[PDB]
Amino acid sequence: IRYSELAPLYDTTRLYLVDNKSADIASLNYQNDHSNFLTTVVQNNDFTPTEASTQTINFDERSRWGGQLKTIMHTNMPNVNEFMYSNKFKARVMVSRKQDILEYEWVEFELPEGNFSVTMTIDLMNNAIIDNYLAVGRQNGVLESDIGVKFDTRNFRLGWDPVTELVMPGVYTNEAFHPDIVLLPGCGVDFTESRLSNLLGIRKRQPFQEGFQIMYEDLEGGNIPALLDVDAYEKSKEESAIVIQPVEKDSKDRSYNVLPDKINTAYRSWYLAYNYGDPEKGVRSWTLLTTSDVTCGVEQVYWSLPDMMQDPVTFRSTRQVSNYPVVGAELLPVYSKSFFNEQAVYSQQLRAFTSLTHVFNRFPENQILVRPPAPTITTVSENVPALTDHGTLPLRSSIRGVQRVTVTDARRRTCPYVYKALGIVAPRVLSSRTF
């Protein structure tokens, strides 16, 4: 028989693992989160649930039986989190300046978890470094021309003459062309330990290489051309109806670190290095340039029901937390949905209007060291359920009254930020075996 308190059933039948038992089985959960939860497979309408979690669903050995897994998962998570390690990035910055003696050290930074736009993420990454000016920058003597790491989106070779490498309008274009690491002399940035690399859209071209630090040395053909001094441009028109000069000045006294025998600033640009730099000796030969993901890439979330069925081949049951079976191997329900704003760059004058605070819009440190104009095309986090059906997994001979359900990521550990994972198993005959 298939149960002793109900009539035996033949052919296809249904079972359910529902996460809606939180008072009928939640005295077994007081350290089991929803990604490791115990829940009944026995759902007797007319029996007390307390005394009915120890009942067993028998399956005769007339034929082998295997359930058909189906999982309905809905996740709500932010895009700055401990899950991806995307709430921290490590960056080499100037940590002291005192005749100048310069110190540099790798200083980890942390973004507050919970965030919305892609544009916001870049801005708070900048603001981390400018809150490290309020730390060791104003308690030493670091110059506001220097900051270590800066993240822009700007392209600095538009309206640019190849023969005379000044930016001829004397200002940089205020349009995004893709994320950029504006990286100072003798400084790197490290994104090995984080997925904030994938947010920028800067990736390795050999991804199984260990380490992922980008040095000032790596960037070649990446020096940012100095602005034309348009004063020299105006007052040469009155002598040709003769002078031309770089903008080395600024009114806050923060000069653009101009390389002395050149018309080029000492600031490097990753974006320039990739495109206009050396083809095989630039930063482009070990990096790739890709579209930004606000989601930071999309992971896989596994299903496991280790003690409720026999596991697929090349697995074995473990109650150890480090290792577990994999079943499904399906997508994370976090996806990216692109949206378009053609006033994207102009809506940073309407967040300037709203917030006169200018600690998000920021005080101009130098006219390179400034927050970047917003991307025209943005990626926006989207949470929609994912439904999936799977093949047969051979079941146990009889099934316990309460059975573990566990979801685990690609790092093989339990997952915060899961609020629905619904097991649906349908037993059916597979093929005859001796009874």
């Binding site: 005295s27 077994l28 959960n29 350290q31 089991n32 007319d46 005394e51």
Partner: protein, 50 residues
């Protein structure tokens, strides 16, 4: 048993009683009884004889 209650009604669903034997019963106290089934019971604050 709630507190100052003098009756406990206990009803069991319809079940076979094939090969049933006796009953035994005793009274415990909520404080001194932990929950078994969970890895940790955070409401258990008693360390005397259970």
């Amino acid at each position: 048993i709630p507190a100052n209650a003098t009756n406990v009604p206990i009803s069991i669903p319809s079940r076979n009683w094939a090969a049933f034997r006796g009953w035994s019963f005793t009274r415990l106290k909520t404080k001194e009884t932990p929950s078994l089934g969970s890895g940790f019971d955070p409401y258990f604050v008693y360390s005397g004889s259970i």
